[PDB]
Amino acid sequence: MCGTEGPNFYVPFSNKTGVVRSPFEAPQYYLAEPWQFSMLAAYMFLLIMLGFPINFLTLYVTVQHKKLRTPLNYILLNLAVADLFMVFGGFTTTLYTSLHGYFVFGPTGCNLEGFFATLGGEIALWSLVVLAIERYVVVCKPMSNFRFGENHAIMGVAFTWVMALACAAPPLVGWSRYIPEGMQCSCGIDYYTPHEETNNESFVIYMFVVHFIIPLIVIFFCYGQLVFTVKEAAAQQQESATTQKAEKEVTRMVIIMVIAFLICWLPYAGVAFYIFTHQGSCFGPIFMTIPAFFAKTSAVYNPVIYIMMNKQFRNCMVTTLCCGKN
C-alpha cells in the first residue's frame, strides 16, 4: 500500500487519509510543498535558458559557416535537435505544469509530453553512440577499403531515429505506458507499477538491455579501441612533438566524454541496484526519479562537451556572436 492507483496514473502517496487526487485534476501538494514545485519550475527555467541558446546556436552557426557542414558533423546537429526536443517537449511543459502542481494537460497530453520528451533523450543517447561508432570506424579502420561519406552519416542519423522510436512509440500502443512520474508534473515510461495489461516487466528488461547496457558497451569499446589505436600510432612516431600532443588531447577528450556519460549512466544503475536489493520498501517520488532529475542537465553539458569544445565550432560561434569580427 505504498501509493494510490487509478486509471492512467500511480501517485506515490498513500490515500489512507483520503487527500490524494488525480495528477490530471488537482495539485499534488501532499507530495511536496508548493515552494518545492516552484524550485522544480526554477530548475526547468535554468535548463530552458541555458539549453535553448546553446543548442539553437549549434544549428545557427552551421548555417553561417561552410566548413562545419561535414558528414562527421551531421550526428552533432542531430544531437542539437534532440536537446531541443527535450527543451520544448519536456522542460517547457514541465515548467508550466509545475506551477499548477499537477499535469494539467490530461492523459492525452501525458502521452504527447512523454513521447516527445522520451524521444528527445533517446535521439541524444544514440547520437553519442553513433558518434562513437563513426569515430571508431574512421580512426581504427576496421574495414579494409572503406571511406565514411555523406550517405553513411545519413544512415547514422536515421539509425538514431529508429532506435528512439523503438523506445518511445511502444508505450503509445500497449507495450508499457506513459504516466505521470515523480511529482506528477511530467510523464514518462512506467517503471513504477507492474501494469500486467501492458507487460511492463518485459519492457523494463528490454529498456535495461537495449537502451542501457548496450549503449555503455558500444561507447566503451569504440573509444577504448580508438585510444589504443592512437597511442599505438604515436608510439611509432615519438620524434613528432605534435603527434604526441595530438595523442594527449584525444585521450583527454575521450576521458571527458566517457566520464560525462558515466555521470549520467551510473545513477540509474545505482538506483536500480538499490531497488533490486532492498526489494521491500516504498520509494518516494524523488528516489526512482533522481537519475532522471539530474540527467536533464545533459541537454546543456553534452553540447558544451561535443560542440563548444570542438575546435571548429568554437571559433565559428565566436565569429557569429561577434557580429562577424574576431
Ligand X SMILES: CC(C)[C@H](C(=O)N1CCC2(CC1)Oc1ccccc1O2)c1ccc(Cl)c(Cl)c1
Ligand Y SMILES: *[C@@H]1O[C@H](CO)[C@@H](O[C@@H]2O[C@H](CO)[C@@H](O[C@@H]3O[C@H](CO[C@H]4O[C@H](CO)[C@@H](O)[C@H](O)[C@@H]4O)[C@@H](O)[C@H](O[C@H]4O[C@H](CO)[C@@H](O)[C@H](O)[C@@H]4O)[C@@H]3O)[C@H](O)[C@H]2NC(C)=O)[C@H](O)[C@H]1NC(C)=O
Q: Of 137, 290, 305, 308, which lies in the binding site for ligand BOG, with binding defined by CB under 6 A?
A: 290
Binding-site ranges for ligand PLM (CB under 6 A): 318, 321-322, 326
Q: Of 13, 22, 44, 211, which lies in the binding site for ligand Y, with binding defined by CB under 6 A?
A: 22
**CA dist., res. 206 & res. 167, Å (int):** 9
Sole window of 53-61, 97-105, 142-150, 204-212 interacting with ligand BOG (rule: CB under 6 A): 97-105
Q: Please tell me whether residue 184 adopts helix, strand or coil conformation.
A: coil
Strand partners, 205: none
Which residue's CB comes closest to ligand PLM? Answer: 322
**CA dist., res. 224 & res. 318, Å (int):** 32
- Can residue 212 be called a binding residue for ligand X (CB under 6 A)? yes
Residue type, 57: L
Q: Are 122 and 212 in contact (CB under 8 A)?
A: no
Q: 204 or 253, CB closer to ligand X? A: 204
Q: Of 3, 10, 13, 20, which lies in the binding site for ligand Y, with binding defined by CB under 6 A?
A: 20
C-alpha cell at 4: 494510490
Question: With CB cut-offs between 5 and 8 Å by kind, which of ligand BOG, ligand Y, ligand PLM, none does residue 298 bind?
Answer: ligand BOG
236 annotated as belonging to a binding site for a ligand: no
Burial class (CB in 10 A: 0-12, 13-18, 19+), 263: middle
**In the complex, least distance from residue 251 CB atom to ligand Y, rounded to whole angstroms:** 54
Residue among 295, 308, 235 at smallest CA distance from 261? 295
Q: Are 222 and 132 in contact (CB under 8 A)?
A: yes
**In the complex, least distance from residue 8 CB atom to ligand Y, rounded to whole angstroms:** 11
- Can residue 188 be called a binding residue for ligand BOG (CB under 6 A)? yes
Residue 85 belongs to what H/E stretch? helix 71-85
Please give the residue ranges that form the binding site for ligand Y (CB under 6 A). Answer: 4, 6, 15, 18, 20-22
Residues in contact with ligand X by CB under 6 A are 118, 121-122, 125, 167, 191, 204, 207-208, 211-212, 215, 264-265, 268, 272, 295
